[PDB]
Write a protein that binds this DNA or RNA. Structure first.
Length: 343
RNA sequence: UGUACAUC
């Protein structure tokens, strides 16, 4: 179960081995740790004829190599450097098995490579994508599958992805708090059409408070703040208003408040800063609490850099009476140069 | 001083 060529190769007997030396031994080498790397590296510069010689051998073991820990790299190399015909032939061996492969550690890498290598205009890719219909959430929740779903969204014509949008109906919030689901949701926000992202964004806005405080959900909300439409940033802002001081002190939500300050309009950014700038909450002002907090102090620094003229004047004036008193904290010892750059 | 994203 091991040709002599492979032994001598692994035993460093062939300092100048070449692709054409592997005639008849391609599938064997493709399953070997060093043989796979060797083939990968040689495929890049191989002639059309040499590449075809290789393809002819990988073809008869294609599916097997797709789920092989080393062989999968050889299959991918062909999606990168293969002819359109060789790529369509490999894809055809994927078709019929998309689901199992999507859920497989090495198979999912092959499917992903095919999606970025063949236009979604082709029937193979078109019919491949459709095999996921009826299993969308299963794949989203899978450690391997989720990456295939992300890949379809990034790569395939959005109109054909309506079955993915449909499968998230009613579960956008829940999946936005899921380690993998949050990634797929962001891909959707990036690549889908206005009609498709509409119901997605509606569900997000129905749970903003829970999302901004979630370990994954806060990324989904910042995405909208960073990349979304003004009408969606405004909805998010409306839910943050009346909550700035509170959310500012939260590990996750504090990043969302920073993003509201950065990507909100002039009148919105000031209404958020005013909430803590010219407002009050007992003996001291909201700024007093935020200054010393392990998280809110990052928000304070952000408002300072984004605030209007008359706004920064007040922020520094409420922070003024507590300067020397603000050294003990390991957190506030960074607002130091802060009140020395705009002071 | 503060949070996610997988193979040789």
């Amino acid at each position: 179960g091991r040709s002599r060529l492979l032994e001598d190769f692994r035993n460093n007997r062939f300092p100048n081995l070449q692709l054409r030396d592997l005639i008849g031994h391609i599938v064997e080498f493709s399953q070997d740790q060093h043989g796979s790397r060797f083939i990968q590296q040689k495929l890049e510069r191989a002639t059309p004829a040499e590449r075809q010689m290789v393809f002819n051998e990988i073809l008869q073991a294609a599916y097997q190599l797709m789920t092989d820990v080393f062989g999968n790299y050889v299959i991918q190399k062909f999606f990168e450097f293969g002819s359109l015909d060789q790529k369509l032939a490999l894809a055809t061996r994927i078709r019929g098995h998309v689901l199992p492969l999507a859920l497989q550690m090495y198979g999912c890498r092959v499917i992903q490579k095919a999606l970025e290598s063949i236009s979604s205009d082709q029937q193979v890719i078109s019919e491949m994508v459709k095999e996921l219909d009826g299993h969308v959430l299963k794949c989203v929740k899978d450690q391997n599958g989720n990456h295939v779903v992300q890949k379809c969204i990034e790569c395939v014509q959005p109109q054909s992805l309506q079955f993915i949008i449909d499968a998230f109906k009613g579960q956008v919030f829940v999946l936005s708090t899921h380690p993998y689901g949050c990634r797929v949701i962001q891909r959707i926000l990036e690549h889908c059409t206005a009609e498709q992202t509409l119901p997605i964004l509606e569900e997000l806005h129905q749970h903003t408070e829970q999302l901004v405080q979630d370990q994954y959900g806060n990324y989904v909300i910042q995405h909208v703040l960073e990349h979304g439409r003004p009408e969606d940033k405004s909805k998010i802002v409306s839910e943050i208003r009346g909550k700035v001081l509170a959310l500012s002190q939260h590990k996750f939500a504090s990043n969302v408040v920073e993003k509201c300050v950065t990507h909100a309009s002039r009148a919105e950014r000031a209404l958020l800063i005013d909430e803590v700038c010219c407002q009050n909450d007992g003996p001291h002002s909201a700024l007093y609490t935020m200054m010393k907090d392990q998280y809110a102090n990052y928000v304070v620094q952000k408002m300072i850099d984004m605030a209007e003229p008359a706004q920064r004047k007040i922020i520094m004036h409420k922070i003024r009476p507590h300067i020397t008193t603000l050294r003990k904290y390991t957190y506030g010892k960074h607002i130091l140069a802060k009140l020395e750059k705009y002071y």
